[PDB]
């Protein structure tokens, strides 16, 4: 579950210690540290490439990092798009069952994801966005009831509400920060957790 390094990579890493190279260690290395658990192959392979390229051209990583930050706006949009896309496919994650209450939960779940997916488009007018915070609060309060009208299930209730809280937290920071990207990513996690609830009443 842990990367291995070749003799040559070991040798590179030792040869490459000038200050200009520190972003290799400060930024990429923790990246590879987290990647490691998810994708051992990828982590190792990419670490190898960075190490070599950096040895051979001290400065290279920093150039790459600074270029990526220069494309913040592209990522901002993509992330908007992801959030927008998230509210779709009502059919799949929903409860298959056509009932009076089980179909009613789907309806209350589809509602919330929808408000949430629209954030990138309301976040600019403080008035509309303010309204949307409210509408979201409803959708949440209204939804969590529809759950208690109908123990790993407990864990989802906990997680949902935890991610529910986190979204508020991130919200509070945006009015102190102007960094919408934190809001989107956040909203988008809540949508996912909403999907996870309905997964347990599918199993």
């Amino acid at each position: 579950g842990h990367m291995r390094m070749t003799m040559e990579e070991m040798k590179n890493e030792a040869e490459t210690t000038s200050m200009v190279s520190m972003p290799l260690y400060a930024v990429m290395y923790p990246v590879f540290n987290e990647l490691e658990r998810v994708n051992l192959s990828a982590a190792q392979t990419l670490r190898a490439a960075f190490i070599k390229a950096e040895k051979e051209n001290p400065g290279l990583t920093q150039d790459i990092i600074m270029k990526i930050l220069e494309k913040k706006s592209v990522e901002v949009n993509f992330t908007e798009s992801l959030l927008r896309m998230a509210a779709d496919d009502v059919e799949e994650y929903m409860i298959e069952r056509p009932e009076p209450e089980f179909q009613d939960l789907n309806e209350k779940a589809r509602a919330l994801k929808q408000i949430l997916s629209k954030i990138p488009d309301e976040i600019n007018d403080r008035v509309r966005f303010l309204q949307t915070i409210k509408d979201i609060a409803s959708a949440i309060k209204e939804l969590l009831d529809t759950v208690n009208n109908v123990r790993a299930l407990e864990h989802q209730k906990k997680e949902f509400v935890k991610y529910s809280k986190s979204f508020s937290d991130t919200l509070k920071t945006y009015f102190k920060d102007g960094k919408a990207i934190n809001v989107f990513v956040s909203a988008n996690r809540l949508i996912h957790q909403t999907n996870l609830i309905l997964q347990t009443f599918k199993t």
């Binding site: 915070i133 409210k134 809280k165 919200l171 509070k172």
Partner: peptide, 10 residues
């Protein structure tokens, strides 16, 4: 519910 009403007021 405490958190919920709090967020709502936020």
């Amino acid at each position: 519910d405490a958190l919920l009403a709090d967020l709502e007021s936020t």
